[PDB]
Amino acid sequence: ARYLGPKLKLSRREGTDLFLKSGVRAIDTKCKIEQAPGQHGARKPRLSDYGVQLREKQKVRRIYGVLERQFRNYYKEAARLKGNTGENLLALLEGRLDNVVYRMGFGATRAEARQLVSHKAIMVNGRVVNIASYQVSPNDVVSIREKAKKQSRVKAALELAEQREKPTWLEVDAGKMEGTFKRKPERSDLSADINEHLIVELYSK
Amino acid sequence: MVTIRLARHGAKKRPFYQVVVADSRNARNGRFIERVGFFNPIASEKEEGTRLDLDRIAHWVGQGATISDRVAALIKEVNKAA
Amino acid sequence: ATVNQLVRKPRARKVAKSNVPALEACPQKRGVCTRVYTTTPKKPNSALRKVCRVRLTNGFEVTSYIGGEGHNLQEHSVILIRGGRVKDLPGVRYHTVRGALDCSGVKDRKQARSKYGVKRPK
Amino acid sequence: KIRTLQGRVVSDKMEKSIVVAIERFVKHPIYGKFIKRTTKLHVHDENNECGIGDVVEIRECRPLSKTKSWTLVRVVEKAV
Amino acid sequence: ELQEKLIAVNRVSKTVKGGRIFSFTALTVVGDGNGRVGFGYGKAREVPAAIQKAMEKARRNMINVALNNGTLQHPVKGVHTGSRVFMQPASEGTGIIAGGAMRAVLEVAGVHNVLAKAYGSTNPINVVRATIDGLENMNSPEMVAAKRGKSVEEIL
Amino acid sequence: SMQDPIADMLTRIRNGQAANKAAVTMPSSKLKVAIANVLKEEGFIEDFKVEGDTKPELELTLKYFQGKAVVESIQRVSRPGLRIYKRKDELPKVMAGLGIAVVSTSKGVMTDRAARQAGLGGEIICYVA
RNA sequence: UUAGCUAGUAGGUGGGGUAACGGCUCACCUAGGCGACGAUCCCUAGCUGGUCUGAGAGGAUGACCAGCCACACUGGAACU
RNA sequence: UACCCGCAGAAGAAGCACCGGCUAACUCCGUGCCAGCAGCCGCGGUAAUACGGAGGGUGCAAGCGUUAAUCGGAAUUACUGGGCGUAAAGCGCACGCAGGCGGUUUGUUAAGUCAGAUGUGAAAUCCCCGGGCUCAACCUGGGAACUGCAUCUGAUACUGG
Ligand SMILES: [Mg+2]
Ligand SMILES: [Mg+2]
Ligand SMILES: [Mg+2]
Ligand SMILES: [Mg+2]
Ligand SMILES: [Mg+2]
Ligand SMILES: [Mg+2]
Ligand SMILES: [Mg+2]
Ligand SMILES: [Mg+2]
Ligand SMILES: [Mg+2]
Ligand SMILES: [Mg+2]
Ligand SMILES: [Mg+2]
Ligand SMILES: [Mg+2]
Ligand SMILES: [Mg+2]
Ligand SMILES: [Mg+2]
Ligand SMILES: [Mg+2]
Ligand SMILES: [Mg+2]
Ligand SMILES: [Mg+2]
Structure with a gap:
């Protein structure tokens, strides 16, 4: 019920650091995190409108260590709650x-x-x-x-x-x-490199 | 006849009775005339465990509604508490 | 067009019959093979498909299509039939599912073994 | 006070009985159109002071025969 | 400054005496991302030239939209040759609920929350014009008060 | 045959606005005057004046702001083939508040805001935006 | 692409019957009653709160539970 | 029994589907319109990212795909929400019964419509605020809702008599 495999291939696929390592070793020295994993990471593929939303949701899911079903339940709870759907989902995560x-x-x-x-x-x-x-x-x-x-x-x-x-x-x-x-963290309090709208657009289907 | 009794509506190993007035010729948790409070044998402390409606119980006993054993043993506890 | 016309004639639906009548709204049906043979597809592509006319239990007789390569089934063989037709073959509307009572799975299969009823290799 | 229904009579060729028609104005549940629906009833018109076309007023009292449970009260619109 | 974005690229053909000669068409949407939006449909013999041809025209043919703080003022509908668009102002957090060639142009324009729906033929070329006319024809409370002759609070 | 004077009035004023007419003269009625009062109280028209003894005529004067017509769309909602009646809490809202929906109620022909403030419904007539 | 159906059938007087009103039944008299707002007939189907989907209106549906009806190898009957 | 505590050992515990576009994922090997894939577009005639395998990658996860049914997309029965000159759509035309609608003013009625109140609209279910199960599923208290119907008391602009 949890990911059991390499902790750096996901970060390479997402393109940014997922904070899956403690931080004693530098992220660049730990692995060649510049390109996607596999034998075809050298090419730069043009990502689609669905592709960017899927990548954002997968990045969020892997950062927070949840599964697809739990993420969907959290999205349902965020939509059920009052206020900004994305901010509520981030706070629940x-x-x-x-x-x-x-x-x-x-x-x-x-x-x-x-x-x-x-x-x-x-x-x-x-x-x-x-x-x-x-x-x-x-x-x-x-x-x-x-x-x-x-x-x-x-x-x-x-x-x-x-x-x-x-x-x-x-x-x-x-x-x-x-x-x-002390209190619930705010969107500005949390990370600012996550596009909240992509997740809700992906799940609006 | 009309009888004040219980009706289990909880889960397995976690009972929860809804004290109701129902005809004797009816199922345990079937059709009831009205609902009068509730009861929970596993209710934790600092929380309500019995909320019987003594006014309605008296109104029904004045019309002849018989009180079953457990509700009769609980109304006395309610009276003793308050 | 207008409410006065629509109250007289309600807007009827456009219900369409299913493409799998012999199943009678059933995922699977057990049948006995009657005529196992090979047929040819239509004009766009030429090949030699493996088909079987099978009499279903309820009474319908249909023509299925054997998937994969290698099928030991023959006449008087009990098979299981599910929905799904073949585009390039006229008449077929159902598929024989491998791994059934008598339909053996494809030999030396490594990918998509579940769709052809193949045991996981050691 | 008592619930009474006013409607036009249809037939009176029965002994101590008439046929009344009620025109209720209801709205269509789907299209929202306001249509009229007939509510034809049989009325035990004792001492039938009624012809054809005149409107009457009836009230429900009790089942008097197989197919009527209404009785006349007053006759309004009697002139033809 | 601008948020230029290509929507889709199409390949057209034209038969001639010697044969058939191909060509490419590009549709782009540009805008400052706050209150302006513009569209450009260019055609060229090759994809790299066509995209720039569309981009230049989109830049020089922008339209200013009097939108709200993050959404559009009031629900609106736009009608074009083959595409009909309906846009409704949503609440914070919903996002750009759109599809086809509408969500991209809406995100470029500046709005962040809107419910969009396409009726009829959902071709990008017509739907872009429909969804920009829908934003052009709508007005703001101040704009409607100006023609009314009253104040915003009075016509609240 | 003329079967909807209110629709005729709406068509006349819409055509006048489209064709840039200064004023639109037409036969009038009590309901027409009541609707014109509401239209003038909201700035959608310049003014109006009933003229005539036996056959009164309304002479509504249109308003033009910066060339473009002030009224964008006037749509007859409740037509004499399908009556529409809405309660106090079910009244419509044209352009989320920027437009009006004229409603004839027991107290007269008022607007959405007036009807909601008074706390009663009515049957709608037309949307003006 | 089911258009006429109904003669205890519609109503009335009196008798009988049910715990109760009632052609429920009987004798007599009237020729009426239903029906293009679908009478009659054929196929299918337990109904409702509800469930799925759908922003909404709607569409499908009657799994569990709960309220009501019918049934107990088939049919007819009566008694306590 | 739930639950708590001590033993020791990282052991006893991960598979399925897909990778040409729709849709997230590419390179070789074996054949050569044969073997075969497929929901559509369609692929294989010796360079197949589409067949089988391998390597790699993507999705889900004690689950993964296929099948059967329902709703959505289907604004593709459109009351919300279509069209009829040419794609399908004006009866060949006229009269006319039932029916649908109906110029303008006053008075009257208040049937529809609008306002308020009462009863009912079972419990259950949905939603909102809290609580109990170590969280959740699940249970539960209150509120809202049950968009409906009947009656009473008024309003008279509109429709209706
Ligand atoms: Mg799980
Ligand atoms: Mg929300
Ligand atoms: Mg008698
Ligand atoms: Mg829909
Ligand atoms: Mg049932
Ligand atoms: Mg594929
Ligand atoms: Mg539909
Ligand atoms: Mg059409
Ligand atoms: Mg034609
Ligand atoms: Mg033709
Ligand atoms: Mg003609
Ligand atoms: Mg003819
Ligand atoms: Mg009234
Ligand atoms: Mg009311
Ligand atoms: Mg808790
Ligand atoms: Mg309820
Ligand atoms: Mg009148």
Whole structure:
């Protein structure tokens, strides 16, 4: 129920970095991410109107580590909710337990955060949750459990989460290994290289 | 005759009764005259577990609607609580 | 044209019959082969297609088209028939599905093995 | 007060009975056209003070025969 | 500045005494992306020349549209020779709900949210003219108030 | 045969606007005067004046703003072959508010905004935009 | 490309019958009743809240559940 | 039993469809209008990105494709929302019954229409706000809705008497 394969072919296909690596190694040195994978990546194919929308949705899906069915359910929920459909979909995508714990900095990558969530290491509001799709509400308390506070990979992720960008909607503290979800992130708060309209145009069919 | 009884509408291993007034010659969860509150044996704390309508229960018992065993054992609990 | 005419004559539909009458709105039907042979397509392209006139259980007798290369089926063979016609063959409206009760699958098949009923190689 | 229906009479060649016609003005559920629909009924017109064409007023009381459950009240429009 | 975009390329032919000589046609839509839009239909012996021929005419034959902040003012319909277009103002987040040669020209023009529908023959050459006439004929509240003689709040 | 005076009036004013007529004279009626009052109260026409003792005539004067006609489309909605009646909450909205839909109601012949403010429906007559 | 159907049939008087009104039934009298707003006849079909699809209007449909009707090898009948 | 806790080992756990355009994905090998593919356009006559295999790529995922039915696209039965000179569409023409519509003013009625109220429109289902199942599916409380009908009290511009 999740991708089990190369973590850089998808990034090469999309054309940009998908943040699937921790960041210790440079993205250019890690792989030849300039062209699409396979034996025909040298050519530059002209992408169609459906092609660009499909590529954008696949990029978003691979970045957030979800499947097609879960993405469709999230799109349905975003359309059901009030306000901007794309912004609501983005907020719901960046509201999962693995995503929020990765943003806090307890996991190196999305896969590492999802594994930590699954293996019963993440606790929300003093409660054990092993669901990778567990939505978090404003004013919650995510925390590393006492047994898992002594993990070398966890503390490595904690020390490696600082040199990169810092979200302005989370309240994190590595001393006690816990954070708080202050408020729902905004579109300007999130990344600005994602075309929201492409996903809704693709799903309007 | 008219009887105040329950009707299961929850799921497997998670019962939830809808206390209703129904004719005796009817199914357990079939046709009922009116709905009077509900009951949940697995209701968690800090949440309602019984919301019986004592006014309607008294109105029906004044017309002769018999009260079944569990609803009779729950109306006394409701009266004791408030 | 006008509401006064339309109330007298309601706008009738344009219902069209299905292209698979012998199925009687059924995905699959079991039949017994009666005449297995080879035919030739029409003018645009020349070839030698493999066809079989089969009597269905309900009573209809139709002409199917064997897919792939290699078919051990013959007369008095129980086969399963699904919808879908062949464009370049007049008369055929159904396809014999391989991997059926007696229709053996295509030998040494590696791609699209499910469409021809081939076990996954080790 | 009492629900009464006013309609034109059709036939009166029956003993203590007449045939009334009611013209209800309804709108077409599909095209929105306003058409008229007949509501022919049999009325137990005791002491038949009615001819052909004159409008009458009837009320439902009870089933009096196999095919009538309406009785006359007053006759308006009697002049021809 | 501009957001020039090619819609589609078509290959035409013309028989002559010696034989048949081919030719290419290009349809392009240009605009500043805020309130202006223009279309260009060029023809040349080759694809690279035809696209530039269409682009130049589209640039020099633009039309200014008095659109809303992100959408169009009021729902409108445009009628052309073979294509009919219907455009309705949507809400924020819907996107350019269009198809064929309408979504591209709508995105180039500047609108971001609109529901578009094509009735009749859905050819790009006619549908582009239909969808630009639909935006040309529509007016703004200030524009309609100017001819009315009242204020926007009065004619709200 | 003349079977819709309101449609005749709408056709006359539309043709006058199309042909750049200063004013359009025609036989008048009470409903025509009521509709002309609404049309003048919204700036769609310049003015009007009933002239005549036995056969009154309306003399509606068109308005031209920067050459182009002020009124874009006047469409007869409820024609005498299909009557259309709408409630207070089901009234139409021409050009999302930029146009009007004349409605004859119990209080008279008012517009969409007036009918909605008063809280009652009526039957529509025509859309003016 | 189903146009005339209906003689207990329409109505009336009286009797009988049902827990109840009623040609429900009987004797008599009137010749009426339905029908191009589709009578009569043929094929098909349990109905509804609902379900799928559709922006909407609409189209299809009656899986589960719930409300109603009919049936219990076929047909006829009556008793408690 | 749900659930919690200790054992050890990354083990016991991924396949299907497609790759000429519609539609996201290209290169060789084997044949040579034969073998074969196909929903359409159509391919194979020795350079097949269309047949079979391989390499590579794309989509979905404990599911993947085919088949059968329904709705959409089909504005292709168009009341919303078409046309009739030439593509299909004005009876050869005229009269006329039922029917459809109907110039202009006043008074009256208020049937349609418009306003308000009452009863009903079962529960269930959809939607909105919350809660419980570790999330979700699922259950549940309230609200809205059930676009309808009947009655009462008024409004009189329009249609109707
Ligand atoms: Mg799954
Ligand atoms: Mg939304
Ligand atoms: Mg008697
Ligand atoms: Mg549709
Ligand atoms: Mg049933
Ligand atoms: Mg293909
Ligand atoms: Mg349709
Ligand atoms: Mg047409
Ligand atoms: Mg012709
Ligand atoms: Mg001809
Ligand atoms: Mg002629
Ligand atoms: Mg003739
Ligand atoms: Mg009235
Ligand atoms: Mg009302
Ligand atoms: Mg919850
Ligand atoms: Mg309900
Ligand atoms: Mg009048």
